[PDB]
Design a protein around this ligand. Structure first.
Ligand SMILES: NC(=[NH2+])NCCC[C@H](N)C(=O)O
Ligand SMILES: [Mg+2]
Ligand SMILES: [Mg+2]
Ligand SMILES: [Mg+2]
Ligand SMILES: [Mg+2]
Ligand SMILES: [Mg+2]
Ligand SMILES: [Mg+2]
Ligand SMILES: [Mg+2]
Ligand SMILES: [Mg+2]
Ligand SMILES: [Mg+2]
Ligand SMILES: [Mg+2]
Ligand SMILES: [Mg+2]
Ligand SMILES: [Mg+2]
Ligand SMILES: [Mg+2]
Ligand SMILES: [Mg+2]
Ligand SMILES: [Mg+2]
Ligand SMILES: [Mg+2]
Ligand SMILES: [Mg+2]
Ligand SMILES: [Mg+2]
Ligand SMILES: [Mg+2]
Ligand SMILES: [Mg+2]
Ligand SMILES: [Mg+2]
Ligand SMILES: [Mg+2]
Ligand SMILES: [Mg+2]
Ligand SMILES: [Mg+2]
Ligand SMILES: [Mg+2]
Ligand SMILES: [Mg+2]
Ligand SMILES: [Mg+2]
Ligand SMILES: [Mg+2]
Ligand SMILES: [Mg+2]
Ligand SMILES: [Mg+2]
Ligand SMILES: [Mg+2]
Ligand SMILES: [Mg+2]
Ligand SMILES: [Mg+2]
Ligand SMILES: [Mg+2]
Ligand SMILES: [Mg+2]
Ligand SMILES: [Mg+2]
Ligand SMILES: [Mg+2]
Ligand SMILES: [Mg+2]
Ligand SMILES: [Mg+2]
Ligand SMILES: [Mg+2]
Ligand SMILES: [Mg+2]
Ligand SMILES: [Mg+2]
Ligand SMILES: [Mg+2]
Ligand SMILES: [Mg+2]
Ligand SMILES: [Mg+2]
Ligand SMILES: [Mg+2]
Ligand SMILES: [Mg+2]
Ligand SMILES: [Mg+2]
Ligand SMILES: [Mg+2]
Ligand SMILES: [Mg+2]
Ligand SMILES: [Mg+2]
Ligand SMILES: [Mg+2]
Ligand SMILES: [Mg+2]
Ligand SMILES: [Mg+2]
Ligand SMILES: [Mg+2]
Ligand SMILES: [Mg+2]
Ligand SMILES: [Mg+2]
Ligand SMILES: [Mg+2]
Ligand SMILES: [Mg+2]
Ligand SMILES: [Mg+2]
Ligand SMILES: [Mg+2]
Ligand SMILES: [Mg+2]
Ligand SMILES: [Mg+2]
Ligand SMILES: [Mg+2]
Ligand SMILES: [Mg+2]
Ligand SMILES: [Mg+2]
Ligand SMILES: [Mg+2]
Ligand SMILES: [Mg+2]
Ligand SMILES: [Mg+2]
Ligand SMILES: [Mg+2]
Ligand SMILES: [Mg+2]
Ligand SMILES: [Mg+2]
Ligand SMILES: [Mg+2]
Ligand SMILES: [Mg+2]
Ligand SMILES: [Mg+2]
Ligand SMILES: [Mg+2]
Ligand SMILES: [Mg+2]
Ligand SMILES: [Mg+2]
Ligand SMILES: [Mg+2]
Ligand SMILES: [Mg+2]
Ligand SMILES: [Mg+2]
Ligand SMILES: [Mg+2]
Ligand SMILES: [Mg+2]
Ligand SMILES: [Mg+2]
Ligand SMILES: [Mg+2]
Ligand SMILES: [Mg+2]
Ligand SMILES: [Mg+2]
Ligand SMILES: [Mg+2]
Ligand SMILES: [Mg+2]
Ligand SMILES: [Mg+2]
Ligand SMILES: [Mg+2]
Ligand SMILES: [Mg+2]
Ligand SMILES: [Mg+2]
Ligand SMILES: [Mg+2]
Ligand SMILES: [Mg+2]
Ligand SMILES: [Mg+2]
Ligand SMILES: [Mg+2]
Ligand SMILES: [Mg+2]
Ligand SMILES: [Mg+2]
Ligand SMILES: [Mg+2]
Ligand SMILES: [Mg+2]
Ligand SMILES: [Mg+2]
Ligand SMILES: [Mg+2]
Ligand SMILES: [Mg+2]
Ligand SMILES: [Mg+2]
Ligand SMILES: [Mg+2]
Ligand SMILES: [Mg+2]
Ligand SMILES: [Mg+2]
Ligand SMILES: [Mg+2]
Ligand SMILES: [Mg+2]
Ligand SMILES: [Mg+2]
Ligand SMILES: [Mg+2]
Ligand SMILES: [Mg+2]
Ligand SMILES: [Mg+2]
Ligand SMILES: [Mg+2]
Ligand SMILES: [Mg+2]
Ligand SMILES: [Mg+2]
Ligand SMILES: [Mg+2]
Ligand SMILES: [Mg+2]
Ligand SMILES: [Mg+2]
Ligand SMILES: [Mg+2]
Ligand SMILES: [Mg+2]
Ligand SMILES: [Mg+2]
Ligand SMILES: [Mg+2]
Ligand SMILES: [Mg+2]
Ligand SMILES: [Mg+2]
Ligand SMILES: [Mg+2]
Ligand SMILES: [Mg+2]
Ligand SMILES: [Mg+2]
Ligand SMILES: [Mg+2]
Ligand SMILES: [Mg+2]
Ligand SMILES: [Mg+2]
Ligand SMILES: [Mg+2]
Ligand SMILES: [Mg+2]
Ligand SMILES: [Mg+2]
Ligand SMILES: [Mg+2]
Ligand SMILES: [Mg+2]
Ligand SMILES: [Mg+2]
Ligand SMILES: [Mg+2]
Ligand SMILES: [Mg+2]
Ligand SMILES: [Mg+2]
Ligand SMILES: [Mg+2]
Ligand SMILES: [Mg+2]
Ligand SMILES: [Mg+2]
Ligand SMILES: [Mg+2]
Ligand SMILES: [Mg+2]
Ligand SMILES: [Mg+2]
Ligand SMILES: [Mg+2]
Ligand SMILES: [Mg+2]
Ligand SMILES: [Mg+2]
Ligand SMILES: [Mg+2]
Ligand SMILES: [Mg+2]
Ligand SMILES: [Mg+2]
Ligand SMILES: [Mg+2]
Ligand SMILES: [Mg+2]
Ligand SMILES: [Mg+2]
Ligand SMILES: [Mg+2]
Ligand SMILES: [Mg+2]
Ligand SMILES: [Mg+2]
Ligand SMILES: [Mg+2]
Ligand SMILES: [Mg+2]
Ligand SMILES: [Mg+2]
Ligand SMILES: [Mg+2]
Ligand SMILES: [Mg+2]
Ligand SMILES: [Mg+2]
Ligand SMILES: [Mg+2]
Ligand SMILES: [Mg+2]
Ligand SMILES: [Mg+2]
Ligand SMILES: [Mg+2]
Ligand SMILES: [Mg+2]
Ligand SMILES: [Mg+2]
Ligand SMILES: [Mg+2]
Ligand SMILES: [Mg+2]
Ligand SMILES: [Mg+2]
Ligand SMILES: [Mg+2]
Ligand SMILES: [Mg+2]
Ligand SMILES: [Mg+2]
Ligand SMILES: [Mg+2]
Ligand SMILES: [Mg+2]
Ligand SMILES: [Mg+2]
Ligand SMILES: [Mg+2]
Ligand SMILES: [Mg+2]
Ligand SMILES: [Mg+2]
Ligand SMILES: [Mg+2]
Ligand SMILES: [Mg+2]
Ligand SMILES: [Mg+2]
Ligand SMILES: [Mg+2]
Ligand SMILES: [Mg+2]
Ligand SMILES: [Mg+2]
Ligand SMILES: [Mg+2]
Ligand SMILES: [Mg+2]
Ligand SMILES: [Mg+2]
Ligand SMILES: [Mg+2]
Ligand SMILES: [Mg+2]
Ligand SMILES: [Mg+2]
Ligand SMILES: [Mg+2]
Ligand SMILES: [Mg+2]
Ligand SMILES: [Mg+2]
Ligand SMILES: [Mg+2]
Ligand SMILES: [Mg+2]
Ligand SMILES: [Mg+2]
Ligand SMILES: [Mg+2]
Ligand SMILES: [Mg+2]
Ligand SMILES: [Mg+2]
Ligand SMILES: [Mg+2]
Ligand SMILES: [Mg+2]
Ligand SMILES: [Mg+2]
Ligand SMILES: [Mg+2]
Ligand SMILES: [Mg+2]
Ligand SMILES: [Mg+2]
Ligand SMILES: [Mg+2]
Ligand SMILES: [Mg+2]
Ligand SMILES: [Mg+2]
Ligand SMILES: [Mg+2]
Ligand SMILES: [Mg+2]
Ligand SMILES: [Mg+2]
Ligand SMILES: [Mg+2]
Ligand SMILES: [Mg+2]
Ligand SMILES: [Mg+2]
Lengths: 59, 149, 202, 64
RNA sequence: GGGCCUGACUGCGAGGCCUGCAAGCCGAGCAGGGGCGAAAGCCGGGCCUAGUGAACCGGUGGUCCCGUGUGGAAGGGCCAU
RNA sequence: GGAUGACCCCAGGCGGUAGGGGAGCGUUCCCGAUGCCGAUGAAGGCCGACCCGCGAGGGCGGCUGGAGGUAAGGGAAGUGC
RNA sequence: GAGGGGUUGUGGCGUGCCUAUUGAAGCAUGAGCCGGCGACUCACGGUCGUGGGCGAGCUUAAGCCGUUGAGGCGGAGGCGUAGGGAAACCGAGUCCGAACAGGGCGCAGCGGCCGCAAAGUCCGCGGCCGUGGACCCGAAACCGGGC
RNA sequence: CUGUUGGGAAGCAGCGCCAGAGAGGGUGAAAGCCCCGUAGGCGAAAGGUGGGGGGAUAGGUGAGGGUACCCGAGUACCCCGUGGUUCGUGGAGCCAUGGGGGAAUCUGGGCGGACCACCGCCUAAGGCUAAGUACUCCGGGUGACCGAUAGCGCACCAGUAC
RNA sequence: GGGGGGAACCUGGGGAACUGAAACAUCUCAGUACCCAGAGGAGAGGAAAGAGAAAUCGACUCCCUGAGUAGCGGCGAGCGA
């Protein structure tokens, strides 16, 4: 199963490492969605910015 | 519910067609065979799938193609049966030849080759071969390809 | 889903067990058709014009007698000749699918559960092979011979006692089958046989 | 008894995935020196058989 | 009638004519490497319609696909004729 | 129309060989049947101007016959001259 | 016993039955008459159609155990799940090709996770085909061994 | 068991009884309890069988090191002519052999589809060997088998009369 | 000790033709029908100079399957491990 992640909340005012997790995810702009594999390495970063991101599991 | 209620559903048990049994039936006299030829006879015609009245036959005027083989016959060589990633969706943990012959996907005596139709899953998949596209998908999805010998 | 009565010393209990609620009559017809056809002997036979005892001699010349042309007297146009397409020894059996038999077995019992005709018993009190003994038990158990009963128990001593009654058909549970279930008006089983029955529909 | 595969058909013909019957075009076994390249090239390809004849051949191959 | 030439192409082939099948026929256009022309273009034989023969079996040139435990070889397959 | 083939109303079709389809009748046998019909008369036979069915047929009654027959609903064929 | 049965004088109309044929009452075939016997079946495989079971799966063969008109076990194997190529081989593609060109043959459920349906497959039934003598009867002949 | 109708009860009726027996066939008609049976049980002095149980007997039995003695002959092997196998001369091997030539004893020989090499498999030219398998003159059991033109050619004095 | 008999069954030694190929010769029918010798309640076969690719199996006989596969074939009809 894959992952469709949406950037819903702004990272402004959040620590530099959460800022980076979006760079690894590839999320750059608000409401932008990227479709990514459900790998535990990708999963650890999504669960990092989970409070700023909207995840739906399209398989 | 006792016996005398047991019935086949409508249409489940049709009567037979009996020929040569009178004018009123529709099938009397000539038994639906018409009149008086080789087809009308007990014994009938030459094989309708092939024979054509003496002329060279539609099948026999076509040319042969390709290796037909010789004695002592088939050459023993390894045989590959492919199964798609879509088929692996039902499994967890490990995937092997013997497991895919049990679920009824891979056939015995056949070496396992994975092909790329569908999505890959984070499974350890042990096969004799992989398609290039199944290889990429498997890596990129958290899966572990494991060749054999 | 069904509430199946149990006879006992300590209470006409109520055991539950999931039998199908949909009964498919045609499927039950298909099981009985199989049951009855696979028991056929297929010993009907006739003789062909090559199996008949006469010789292969032309009885009289083809032409110039004023009679019809004939070959040998074994031909099926003669009285005493062979018979055309007569019955030959046959096997009428065939492999009805297991899931059709198995589900037909659940359906047959479910049909008697709908009616209150299925009755289970813990044991049989004083019956030890004597018909008079089974008869007394049946009466206190509410089987007075007005309804035909399929008794299904592994107790040999209980099957011997009942088997000669005109209204009773005895079976060991391994022999439970839809024809005998549908043949009768009521179903009476051990708990040991009921357990066996559950182990055959799963 | 069980039907036998016609080997003459087996050696000339194939049943495709949707049930069509393909064979080699005829007419280039020999006498090709005065045949145009268009004639040789196109006679090098497979063709789908007309439906009546295909349905006859398929019956001869009951285990493909 | 003359000049230069070899398209009397290789790899394909949209769409059709004809038609019981199998055949037969016409074909723009794209690619390879060319010929003629300043060029627009033309050229996949010949003004056109006859000048022909399905398959099986075998020959020859190529290809290097198969090679009966393995490497070869025998013998096949494929392309051409 | 009414909900279903419950029946009714309206309109149209309904010559037929080869031949395609459909719906039925009857014969032998099995399940139903440890039943049921039967000496107050089984099957079969001979009548009938009677009833039901388009028809194949099925009843009913009289006579003969003297011991068998077998429903509703299904099953299988040595099934109709 | 306002109806019905039997009979048939007169009047009207009126070319047997079957087979074969372009066409028969036909002066074309068959049949004296009556009764009984008498011709489209079965096995295995195939192919459609159909009634059910299960469904990315479906199904067991021999046999084993039970029964004594009881059913069960048994997964060996078979069909299906992937095609294209003479093949090596590759694979949702592949083959021809120099081609990433063109072309052949291939690839993709209805509903509010459960229902409904469905590839497929198993069994029953039915039509037709193949193999058998294959709807029934009929030669003249051929061969074998004897008389 | 009794009564009743009837030529006859086993039919109908009253009241009973058995059942490890309600398979079936009889008895003047239609009988669980009348007869023969059926369920369940028992039975061989004599002959046959005895594949199972027991007991005899025949036969069965190491390790190194050395020696290179033996290991199935008109055989193997090759060639010619055939057969067998799925193999019809095919690239034609394998197993068999009518003709000709013709070895060796393990460092011997045959095979793995011409052939060669490599790698393996196997031990020819002496013999025997239960069980599982086939058939049905004979006996019994059982039929959605026939019912006297049917079923065997024969239900009967039939392989007869002719 | 042999001889001769025995319904089929079995082994061995010999061995057709109609037919099918819509003619026919190779091919088929078929090592079938039949003749002959022998066997016994069975007969044959049987303890690898096997199989053939599993770096494997492990006498023979018989059923199922593998499989109408592999192949054979005027590469026709068909035959068929
Ligand atoms: N245990 C049994 N097999 N019971 C079934 C009845 C057996 C026998 N057919 C009888 O009627 O008595
Ligand atoms: Mg903020
Ligand atoms: Mg940090
Ligand atoms: Mg039927
Ligand atoms: Mg009918
Ligand atoms: Mg039929
Ligand atoms: Mg019909
Ligand atoms: Mg007829
Ligand atoms: Mg009629
Ligand atoms: Mg019709
Ligand atoms: Mg008609
Ligand atoms: Mg007629
Ligand atoms: Mg017809
Ligand atoms: Mg028809
Ligand atoms: Mg017809
Ligand atoms: Mg006719
Ligand atoms: Mg005509
Ligand atoms: Mg005609
Ligand atoms: Mg006629
Ligand atoms: Mg005609
Ligand atoms: Mg005709
Ligand atoms: Mg006719
Ligand atoms: Mg005729
Ligand atoms: Mg005939
Ligand atoms: Mg004919
Ligand atoms: Mg092949
Ligand atoms: Mg071989
Ligand atoms: Mg029968
Ligand atoms: Mg029969
Ligand atoms: Mg007969
Ligand atoms: Mg007979
Ligand atoms: Mg005869
Ligand atoms: Mg005869
Ligand atoms: Mg005779
Ligand atoms: Mg005879
Ligand atoms: Mg005689
Ligand atoms: Mg004769
Ligand atoms: Mg004759
Ligand atoms: Mg004779
Ligand atoms: Mg004769
Ligand atoms: Mg004459
Ligand atoms: Mg005369
Ligand atoms: Mg006469
Ligand atoms: Mg006559
Ligand atoms: Mg005559
Ligand atoms: Mg005759
Ligand atoms: Mg005769
Ligand atoms: Mg007879
Ligand atoms: Mg007779
Ligand atoms: Mg007859
Ligand atoms: Mg016949
Ligand atoms: Mg006949
Ligand atoms: Mg028959
Ligand atoms: Mg039989
Ligand atoms: Mg059938
Ligand atoms: Mg069967
Ligand atoms: Mg009873
Ligand atoms: Mg009863
Ligand atoms: Mg019973
Ligand atoms: Mg009984
Ligand atoms: Mg061929
Ligand atoms: Mg050609
Ligand atoms: Mg040619
Ligand atoms: Mg060529
Ligand atoms: Mg050539
Ligand atoms: Mg030219
Ligand atoms: Mg050209
Ligand atoms: Mg050219
Ligand atoms: Mg080319
Ligand atoms: Mg197959
Ligand atoms: Mg396939
Ligand atoms: Mg010029
Ligand atoms: Mg130049
Ligand atoms: Mg076109
Ligand atoms: Mg055309
Ligand atoms: Mg160009
Ligand atoms: Mg250019
Ligand atoms: Mg140019
Ligand atoms: Mg230039
Ligand atoms: Mg230019
Ligand atoms: Mg052009
Ligand atoms: Mg010209
Ligand atoms: Mg010119
Ligand atoms: Mg031409
Ligand atoms: Mg030929
Ligand atoms: Mg050739
Ligand atoms: Mg190579
Ligand atoms: Mg190589
Ligand atoms: Mg090799
Ligand atoms: Mg080398
Ligand atoms: Mg070399
Ligand atoms: Mg060649
Ligand atoms: Mg070569
Ligand atoms: Mg070559
Ligand atoms: Mg190539
Ligand atoms: Mg060519
Ligand atoms: Mg009209
Ligand atoms: Mg009409
Ligand atoms: Mg209709
Ligand atoms: Mg009827
Ligand atoms: Mg009738
Ligand atoms: Mg009967
Ligand atoms: Mg009865
Ligand atoms: Mg009765
Ligand atoms: Mg009465
Ligand atoms: Mg009386
Ligand atoms: Mg009377
Ligand atoms: Mg009768
Ligand atoms: Mg009447
Ligand atoms: Mg009287
Ligand atoms: Mg009467
Ligand atoms: Mg009687
Ligand atoms: Mg009657
Ligand atoms: Mg009846
Ligand atoms: Mg009925
Ligand atoms: Mg029934
Ligand atoms: Mg008949
Ligand atoms: Mg009058
Ligand atoms: Mg008038
Ligand atoms: Mg008149
Ligand atoms: Mg008129
Ligand atoms: Mg007249
Ligand atoms: Mg007239
Ligand atoms: Mg008439
Ligand atoms: Mg005529
Ligand atoms: Mg005429
Ligand atoms: Mg006249
Ligand atoms: Mg006249
Ligand atoms: Mg006249
Ligand atoms: Mg005349
Ligand atoms: Mg006349
Ligand atoms: Mg005539
Ligand atoms: Mg006639
Ligand atoms: Mg006469
Ligand atoms: Mg008369
Ligand atoms: Mg008559
Ligand atoms: Mg038919
Ligand atoms: Mg059949
Ligand atoms: Mg069918
Ligand atoms: Mg079907
Ligand atoms: Mg099922
Ligand atoms: Mg299953
Ligand atoms: Mg292929
Ligand atoms: Mg393509
Ligand atoms: Mg395409
Ligand atoms: Mg469904
Ligand atoms: Mg289905
Ligand atoms: Mg058909
Ligand atoms: Mg035959
Ligand atoms: Mg026939
Ligand atoms: Mg037929
Ligand atoms: Mg003569
Ligand atoms: Mg001859
Ligand atoms: Mg001759
Ligand atoms: Mg002659
Ligand atoms: Mg002679
Ligand atoms: Mg009296
Ligand atoms: Mg009395
Ligand atoms: Mg009994
Ligand atoms: Mg009785
Ligand atoms: Mg009796
Ligand atoms: Mg009675
Ligand atoms: Mg009775
Ligand atoms: Mg009695
Ligand atoms: Mg006993
Ligand atoms: Mg006894
Ligand atoms: Mg030593
Ligand atoms: Mg030595
Ligand atoms: Mg030796
Ligand atoms: Mg010697
Ligand atoms: Mg030789
Ligand atoms: Mg040879
Ligand atoms: Mg040979
Ligand atoms: Mg060859
Ligand atoms: Mg050979
Ligand atoms: Mg020799
Ligand atoms: Mg050695
Ligand atoms: Mg050596
Ligand atoms: Mg040797
Ligand atoms: Mg050798
Ligand atoms: Mg070898
Ligand atoms: Mg060798
Ligand atoms: Mg080799
Ligand atoms: Mg070996
Ligand atoms: Mg023993
Ligand atoms: Mg023995
Ligand atoms: Mg034995
Ligand atoms: Mg007997
Ligand atoms: Mg009788
Ligand atoms: Mg008589
Ligand atoms: Mg007789
Ligand atoms: Mg009589
Ligand atoms: Mg007799
Ligand atoms: Mg007779
Ligand atoms: Mg006499
Ligand atoms: Mg002697
Ligand atoms: Mg003797
Ligand atoms: Mg003797
Ligand atoms: Mg022999
Ligand atoms: Mg001898
Ligand atoms: Mg011989
Ligand atoms: Mg001779
Ligand atoms: Mg011949
Ligand atoms: Mg034929
Ligand atoms: Mg034949
Ligand atoms: Mg012929
Ligand atoms: Mg012919
Ligand atoms: Mg001739
Ligand atoms: Mg011939
Ligand atoms: Mg032969
Ligand atoms: Mg042969
Ligand atoms: Mg012989
Ligand atoms: Mg014989
Ligand atoms: Mg003897
Ligand atoms: Mg024995
Ligand atoms: Mg022996
Ligand atoms: Mg021996
Ligand atoms: Mg030995
Ligand atoms: Mg297979
Ligand atoms: Mg198969």
């Amino acid at each position: 199963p894959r992952l469709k992640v949406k950037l819903v909340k702004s990272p402004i005012g959040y620590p530099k490492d959460q800022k980076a997790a979006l760079k690894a995810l590839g999320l750059r702009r608000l409401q932008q969605e990227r479709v990514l594999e459900d790998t535990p390495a990708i999963r650890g970063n999504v669960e990092k910015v989970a409070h700023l991101v909207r995840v739906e599991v399209v398989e | 519910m006792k016996l005398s209620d047991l019935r086949p559903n409508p249409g489940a048990n049709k009567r037979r067609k009996r020929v040569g049994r009178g004018p009123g039936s529709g099938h009397g006299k000539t038994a639906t065979r018409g009149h008086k030829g080789q087809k009308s006879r007990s014994g009938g015609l030459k094989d309708p799938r092939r024979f054509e009245g003496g002329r060279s036959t539609t099948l026999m005027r076509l040319p042969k193609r390709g290796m037909q083989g010789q004695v002592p016959g088939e050459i023993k060589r390894p045989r590959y049966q492919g199964v798609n990633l879509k088929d692996l969706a039902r499994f967890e943990g490990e995937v092997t030849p013997e497991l895919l012959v049990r679920a009824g996907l891979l056939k015995k005596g056949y070496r396992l080759k994975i092909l790329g139709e569908g999505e890959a899953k984070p499974l350890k998949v042990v096969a004799h071969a992989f398609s290039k596209s199944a290889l990429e998908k498997l890596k990129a999805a958290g899966g572990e390809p494991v060749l054999l010998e | 889903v069904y509430q199946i009565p149990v006879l006992s010393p300590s209470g006409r209990r109520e055991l539950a067990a999931d039998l199908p609620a949909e009964i498919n009559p045609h499927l039950l017809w298909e099981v009985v058709r199989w049951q009855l056809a696979k028991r056929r002997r297929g010993t009907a036979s006739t003789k062909t014009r090559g199996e008949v005892a006469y010789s292969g001699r032309k009885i009289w010349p083809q032409k110039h007698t004023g009679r019809a042309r004939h070959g040998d007297i074994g031909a099926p146009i003669f009285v005493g000749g062979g018979v055309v397409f007569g019955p030959k020894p046959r096997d009428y059996s065939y492999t009805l699918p297991k899931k059709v038999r198995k589900k037909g077995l659940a359906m047959a019992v479910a049909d008697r559960a709908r009616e209150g005709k299925l009755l289970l018993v813990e044991a049989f009190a004083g019956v030890n092979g004597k018909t008079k003994e089974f008869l007394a038990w049946a009466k206190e158990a509410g089987l007075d011979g007005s309804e035909s009963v399929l008794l299904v128990t592994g107790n040999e001593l209980v099957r011997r006692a009942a088997r000669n009654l005109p209204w009773v058909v005895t079976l060991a549970p391994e022999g439970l089958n839809v024809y005998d279930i549908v043949r009768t008006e009521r179903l009476v089983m051990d708990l040991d046989a009921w357990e066996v029955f559950q182990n055959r529909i799963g | 008894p069980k039907m036998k595969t016609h080997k003459g058909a087996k050696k000339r013909v194939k049943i495709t995935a949707s049930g069509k019957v393909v064979a080699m075009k005829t007419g280039k076994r020999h006498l090709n020196w005065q045949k145009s390249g268009k004639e040789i090239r196109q006679k090098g390809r497979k063709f789908v058989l007309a439906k009546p004849e295909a349905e006859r051949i398929k019956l001869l191959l009951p285990y493909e």
